[PDB]
Amino acid sequence: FDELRIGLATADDIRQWSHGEVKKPETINYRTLKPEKDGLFCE
Amino acid sequence: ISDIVVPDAKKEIVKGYEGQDEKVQKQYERGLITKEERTQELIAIWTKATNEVAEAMNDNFPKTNPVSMMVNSGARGNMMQMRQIAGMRGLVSNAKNETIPRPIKASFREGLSVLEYFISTHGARKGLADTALRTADSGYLTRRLVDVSQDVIIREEDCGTERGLKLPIATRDADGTLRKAEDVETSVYARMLAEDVVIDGKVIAPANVDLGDVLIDALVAHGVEEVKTRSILTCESQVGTCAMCYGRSLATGKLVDIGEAVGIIAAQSIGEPGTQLTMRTFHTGGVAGD
Amino acid sequence: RPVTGPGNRPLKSLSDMLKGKQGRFRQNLLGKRVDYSARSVIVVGPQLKLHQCGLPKAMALELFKPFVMKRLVDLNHAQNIKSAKRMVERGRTVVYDVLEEVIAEHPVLLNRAPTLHRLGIQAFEPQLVEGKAIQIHPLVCTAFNADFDGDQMAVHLPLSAEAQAEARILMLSSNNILKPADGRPVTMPTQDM
Amino acid sequence: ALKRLKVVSAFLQTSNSPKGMVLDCVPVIPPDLRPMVQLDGGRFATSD
Amino acid sequence: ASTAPLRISFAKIKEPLEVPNLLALQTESFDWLLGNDAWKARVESALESGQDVPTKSGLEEIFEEISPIEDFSGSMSLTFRDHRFEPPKNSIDECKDRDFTYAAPLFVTAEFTNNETGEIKSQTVFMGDFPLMTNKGTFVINGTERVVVSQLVRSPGVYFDSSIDKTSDKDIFSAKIIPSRGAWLEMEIDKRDMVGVRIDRKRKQSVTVLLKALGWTTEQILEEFGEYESMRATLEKDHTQGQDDALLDIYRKLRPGEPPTREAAQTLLENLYFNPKRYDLAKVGRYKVNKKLGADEPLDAGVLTTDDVIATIKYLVKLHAGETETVGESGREIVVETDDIDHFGNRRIRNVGELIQNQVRTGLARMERVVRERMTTQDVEAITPQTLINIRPVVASIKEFFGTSQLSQFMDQNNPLSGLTHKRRLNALGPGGLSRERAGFEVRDVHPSHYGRMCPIETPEGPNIGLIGSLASYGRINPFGFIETPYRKVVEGQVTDDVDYLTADEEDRFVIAQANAALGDDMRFAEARVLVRRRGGEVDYVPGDDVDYMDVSPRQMVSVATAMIPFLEHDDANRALMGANMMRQAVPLIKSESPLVGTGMEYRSAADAGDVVKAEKAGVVQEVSADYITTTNDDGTYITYRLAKFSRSNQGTSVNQKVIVAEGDRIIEGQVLADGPATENGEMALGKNLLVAFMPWEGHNYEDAIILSQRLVQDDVLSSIHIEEHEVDARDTKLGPEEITRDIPNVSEEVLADLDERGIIRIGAEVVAGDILVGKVTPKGETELTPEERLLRAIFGEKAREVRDTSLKVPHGEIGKVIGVRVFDREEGDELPPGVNQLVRVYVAQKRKITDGDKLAGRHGNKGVISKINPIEDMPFLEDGTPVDIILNPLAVPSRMNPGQVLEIHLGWLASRGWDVSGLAEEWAQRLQVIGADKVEPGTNVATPVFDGAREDELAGLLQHTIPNRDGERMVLPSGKARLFDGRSGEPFPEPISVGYMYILKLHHLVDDKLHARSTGPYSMITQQPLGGKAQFGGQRFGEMEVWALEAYGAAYALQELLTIKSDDVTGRVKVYEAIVKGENIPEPGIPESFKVLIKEMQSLCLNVEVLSSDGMSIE
Amino acid sequence: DSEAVVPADAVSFTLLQEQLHSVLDTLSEREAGVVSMRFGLTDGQPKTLDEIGKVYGVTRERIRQIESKTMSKLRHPSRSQVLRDYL
Amino acid sequence: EGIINPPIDELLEATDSKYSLVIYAAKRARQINAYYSQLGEGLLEYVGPLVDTHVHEKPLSIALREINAGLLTSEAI
Amino acid sequence: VHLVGEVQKVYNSQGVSIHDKHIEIIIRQMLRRVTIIESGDAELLPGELVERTKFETENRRVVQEGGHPASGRPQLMGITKASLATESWLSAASFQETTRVLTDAAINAKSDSLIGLKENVIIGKLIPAGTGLSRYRNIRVEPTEEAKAAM
Ligand SMILES: [Mg+2]
Ligand SMILES: [Zn+2]
């Protein structure tokens, strides 16, 4: 901890941060109560 | 019930005053005087009456009664609280900062009448609201002061320079004598002399010593009119401010340690009595912006 | 117009979580909640010394649960740690005796809510006392601006050796006689004495 | 012109390009920081 | 006659008017809303008596306001003629017990008529359950007694404002019409020497364009308005002319982006104002507008007309022109002047009836929209009133009001006075009104109009100071919504026994005298000089026969709560306010005792409060018992009253009800048969009266702390029951059903010792923290046994089972004897919410005795925490050996400016020991002899009305003549002080001490509720810091000023642990607990979690917040 | 939340681990090793009997008997008083 | 037998500063605390209480007693 | 002098007494920046707030380089503006206006050096004031040889 550099986040940086891509608005199936595939909360 | 003894002369003085008041009302009924002039003369008349009855009560009460013992000692209370407990309350503020023409003539021992109680509540509720708002404003002021005053820590033992600040050690010197300043404590005490002082060819107060009662008294007796006290304003320190310029801390009585957060303490001290202030103009006087 | 969502209230936003009185900056980074703490109404204790504060048995026991458990395990009052926890939860006499033994020579920082100036937090020597209200020395009251109409004062526990060192040396109640505003006594109130 | 110079020079000296103004990919908060926690009673609790 | 127990009266003036029904405000408003038998009986009684009253009820008025819906063809119509009720299916106790809203059905006859069919079809429809109000002014919704508080608002009408602008150096005037429902309008004059109009404040515009857009022509405009030069200047500077041009101009300014259309603009102007639906001005709005503008009998109900707009324009210029008296347009001469909004003639209370009516109105408007859509999407001959009307909006709005609304407030049943004061409060905060942020100095401040219409003394002392206030004692509500107060009539200087009710505006014109003014033996005034009050709150006197009204009772200005305090006149306003706020928290005790000294009005407050159980028939009691009392009227009807016994109130206090009447005593209608909480013989009793001596005492009573005997703990003088209610629900989850059983898993055998057969704690089983109340077990869970657990189980051969304990346990720090348990089973006939198979509630009741820390207070704003309870012998005792039950610091009364408590103490002493005055021939003796309070036996209570109390001469003279208690000697010296022997050291105190009896109350700020502690407990989810509150083991907050104060000390390490180790660091907390337990030194703190949350969030706004080191990347 | 590791449970489990390891060390080296493998006190996956009987060089049944003897010895009142309180 | 039992003036003049005294007594308290919890390794570098100690004691109290006695010395690196 | 006297007489009107150093430190904080004028040789903008130290350093640099110094006039601004216009954006961000500072800091791409207090309370590190200083915290402890000789 010496300096908290801040700046504009370019598209390349946001892609680098991401561990995947979100393609659906699904959150959790109404029965199994588990996170869905490729949506929000996806494991 | 017998501890609070209302002055005996009160009834006679107040009936004399009300006789004069009804004379003025009679001479107003004929139009000889404008209503505003009536209000002004009446307000002055009743201010004089309440001051005089306060003096009469102050003379009346003995030194041995409990209220005198617990007000004179500094235990609690104030003389005006006893004034409105024993003597008549006096003029009370009307809503939106006005004054009533018929001030409360009764003390809390005798008991206020109905309209008197109502017109007192008029000011009481305003006082409570003012207290709440002043508390909030003081809190916000303290936050702002603490934020702007952060990052100023003592990070040097002694300053690299010698420049100082001129302060009035003694003022209001009557003819043929020297009188010290009335508020010498908050200004020059707990400060640090930048350089020695010589008045009779001999050093009186050495350099870099804290000022107390004995030193200030001796310097005033020697007759010096000013003094050059080192202060943070003129401090020339490469890193923050030095301990020497700031002078002794006030909670310890000793030279401020290196690394002490002086800015936070300064902001807290400034903002602490913000709730206690609660001062406001008694009356606008009918003029805005003056 | 904002994105009202349900219609009752505007929705929270990424920037809204980073802004305002309830934002992260001023509510979860500069002022945080803390474990090992307590709160209770305050009563006046005149028989105390300037460096003492009375902690009810329940509050003292709950604050010092780890230390009480360690002392119980060391003195063989409880067989193992879990038995010690069961015993302290039950609240037997030996638990309170161990508590009386363990609290001593360990400072606790009494603190009132407004904390206008640095004397708002003052370390004290705890002392077990019956009842459920904190006993506080009348002299140090006026520094807290703490009357006894009805008032709650938070008690915080310095854990590390450094923390209790500071509380013993710096934040002590007896080393703060003078008010920092103008360097005059503040630890000699005037109501009764 | 003073304000324009201030911002233009601030962008010139910094290595980051001005195109960061127009984002192309929107980051997503980690799910635990926007919890859809199970709540007793068959109900649910969600962040906006 | 026998209404109330005897109470010696010190009042000096007789009261013509008796105090009205203290709860009329709620019950009569709801009767009007319902339009039941009571409201129409009242209406016809007023009509035959000549008194005005609205002849149309609330529900029927709102139904009739909705005209039959007409489609685009106008062929069809629905008529809602008559509405009716049926008796409620659930009894009040039944609804309270089983969690049902106390409601009744409401039907209405809908008639279907179509011109094309030429037939009329009638059919009754039912719109849902209507939440009904019990006779005691409370809505029992979902088992919880709610109360709807009246709301202060600005009544609709015109309001003119005068202001000064520093830049302009001249006065600025503005006008505003405030509608009841529609969009608002303002008319500013000489903003910059020209007059303008604010049409929704959309854009800058002149007055000339508006007038031209109307049919009024320029010639007649200047003819009428040619006498004022300013508006002539406005006219001539206006270049545009012609109605069409002005209309299209204003339309373009209002709705730019499209070309102007004549018909569309005219329809828009008609819609925004002249439409009767959008601009529905209430009856009060028209009523006050016709008076203010002076128009003589305009349309009784309707929208503003062009005549009204021109009249307002005229009035505005007359006010600006400086003329103070001018002819009103189409009206008589009227004073033109600026009006202040805060005047109580401009403030209107929305009683419960009007609030519920507004909610019903919006529900019915939604219903009308839905049915109109259905007509637009339905075929003829298949349309009937049953199928078309959708009842969801009405029920869902009247249900969304009583829940989730500021005005429908949770009842506080701390005591009957708290209930009354909650009923009578006028909450200015709420929807469509003065909010907390919108508060200013003026609104909170008292006004001269608040005299008999609002109590100035009592109000919340918190941030909402003055915004909420209790209605005056004698206040009554105008049908329009204003507040009246009674006044006695005066004619040729003779006071008549006739009463007229005056509102806030009718009062201004006349001159009102003061009730405390003396009167002669004859009905004429004794003294020519009489104090009066006049317009503007002036207090100038007017001697002789000049007044016309005077106050009927000196306690008009004080509400019910403030009127309780004795010797209120001697107390400061601030302390009186604090005492009034404090009296609404005294808890009922095991045994209640009525005050020895107090107002004469506690009986009315107690009886009008619903807690007391009074008889409805004049009969003889036949069976008296603890559970119930039976009475038999002479007619033959038998009625038995069931007395509630130890049932939890809203705040968690017992509501035990005692019994007074004997077996064979006679009863009169309305007589009190059973007390309630904080009551005795029908008299309010919020506390016990303790012998008090004023002295500092070894520092225990320092800074208002209180010292009291161990007698109070020993004799249960100050002891109260406190019943807690916590419940669990055996819900059904995905894995399986949770089971309430005695076979709890992973437990010992002795924990489940007192449980019943099905796993419920028995009745009467004392519990403590951790004791099992009801045993419940989770269905199952995916259990992956850990290696250590596996080995331990195998060694011990115990089978860990999927079922997991979730039993209810008493929260930490609790004790009490269980008194009752209730079970509701799904499979049984009982109904439950979805999912919950079984629900169990357990009542745990404890007899909390007074102890150190518990808050105590008196009536006069003197409050303190108990600091020590010395034994009976340590108390400084009196000469006869009677210890003083409480020591109070003398330092308080002079500084607090509340010497009324000293007067109360002296009068309590005088009441305790009777007095005998006969033939003394003294002035005070004469006053007592004519009053009748001359011979008083020991112990009898005394009544000192709030502003007609006992004069100090009376108290002194009585103290001279107290009955000799023992050995023919009086213990209290003439000065009111007595000899006090020190209990501990023994020697007498050097000087006498003031002693007497004070009425002390036990507040609800008990130390048991406040005490909270936390080694380590639950943590929050989104941020890993500890969560707050006491119910969830919450750590205290270390605010910003705390960290500032710690920085001021320079203590960095204590801060570092107080921010990292003790919260917000997940890795650090387990490590520090482990180190403390193992004795190892505390480990180095890590980084906090909230900082990680912050950096992750700011990374989500496209700000690449990178933590870097001096030498390249940093290690974290 | 439910995921937060209760410090009381964590420290109790660590003390349980220490006590269990010490009690196993009290037993003979081979016996402690085989029972630990049978119950995965070193690794999260316990090895069934014949799977213990590969690295140690003993049969699927010899390992069974010595595991049974270890269980019997641990069930002795000696090495049970400390572990009983931990459940 | 109290927190004030070692008066602050002697320690302060021994260490010449107040924060320095806090940190130095804290370091010594940590050292004695980690000594008392050795439980058998017997590292040569660790040093136990120089002054006499009770059967149950706080490490910081013994550290401050050592500072007051003066037999302990410090040296900034 | 004017500021100190005004605020002191405001406080003394009621009866409270605050020492003058507490005011003086804040008054020095307000007067810290200087408005630059005639920014010819210094090459930066004219008429914007600049810290005294930065102005002195730039003047020394330019006079050493031979260019005539850029003039400046002292400027007094309220505490709020002074706090907002601080080098550490992580402290200004913690202050009242979070959004604006974050936008301008991001555009400027300024790295927040952790010197200061409010930023070191956020990170959870040790504040550099009091026991958290470097000089106090680097000391090592060991008894004397005679103490070991005795025991
Ligand atoms: Mg308080
Ligand atoms: Zn310096």
Side-chain angles (χ1 to χ4, degrees), chain E residues 977-993:
Chain E
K977 301 192 263 195
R979 301 283 316 294
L980 272 282
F981 296 170
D982 192 350
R984 318 216 289 197
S985 298
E987 69 286 8
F989 281 118
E991 47 171 292
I993 299 294

Side-chain angles (χ1 to χ4, degrees), chain A:
Chain A
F1 274 130
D2 318 57
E3 30 173 309
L4 274 79
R5 208 175 58 182
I6 165 163
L8 284 308
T10 60
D12 306 358
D13 190 1
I14 299 173
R15 272 191 191 79
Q16 179 153 323
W17 296 343
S18 96
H19 299 65
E21 210 270 11
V22 182
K23 285 187 226 301
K24 301 283 291 313
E26 295 210 339
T27 63
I28 40 161
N29 164 34
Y30 76 111
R31 190 191 289 90
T32 81
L33 261 295
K34 283 178 97 182
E36 303 306 275
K37 182 70 162 36
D38 224 29
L40 306 196
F41 294 67
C42 176
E43 296 103 325

Side-chain angles (χ1 to χ4, degrees), chain C residues 112 147 150-151:
Chain C
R112 201 161 171 280
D147 58 316
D151 276 309

Side-chain angles (χ1 to χ4, degrees), chain B residues 67-185:
Chain B
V67 186
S68 181
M69 266 177 159
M70 101 183 67
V71 70
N72 296 130
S73 76
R76 260 259 295 284
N78 196 340
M79 172 47 28
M80 73 95 71
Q81 280 105 55
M82 207 209 159
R83 196 181 46 72
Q84 56 191 268
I85 286 160
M88 48 158 281
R89 269 191 49 69
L91 281 65
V92 68
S93 165
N94 177 284
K96 74 200 75 54
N97 305 8
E98 255 74 15
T99 315
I100 89 169
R102 202 68 45 70
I104 297 130
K105 308 208 314 301
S107 84
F108 280 121
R109 169 147 144 66
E110 313 298 350
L112 307 179
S113 203
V114 195
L115 254 292
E116 299 168 9
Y117 210 111
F118 188 47
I119 64 197
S120 83
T121 47
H122 293 175
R125 291 256 303 264
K126 197 194 300 193
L128 290 190
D130 165 288
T131 279
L133 268 289
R134 296 280 276 208
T135 325
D137 275 316
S138 65
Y140 181 38
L141 173 69
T142 297
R143 167 162 188 287
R144 257 181 301 178
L145 264 295
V146 167
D147 176 23
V148 75
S149 183
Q150 82 183 42
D151 213 2
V152 48
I153 319 298
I154 311 299
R155 314 171 161 300
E156 176 161 300
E157 175 41 67
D158 173 51
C159 208
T161 193
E162 191 46 290
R163 55 222 297 164
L165 211 65
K166 306 214 67 74
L167 260 76
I169 188 134
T171 63
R172 301 215 311 279
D173 321 314
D175 305 358
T177 174
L178 256 295
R179 309 299 190 188
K180 54 150 69 181
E182 190 63 39
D183 66 3
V184 73
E185 271 70 40

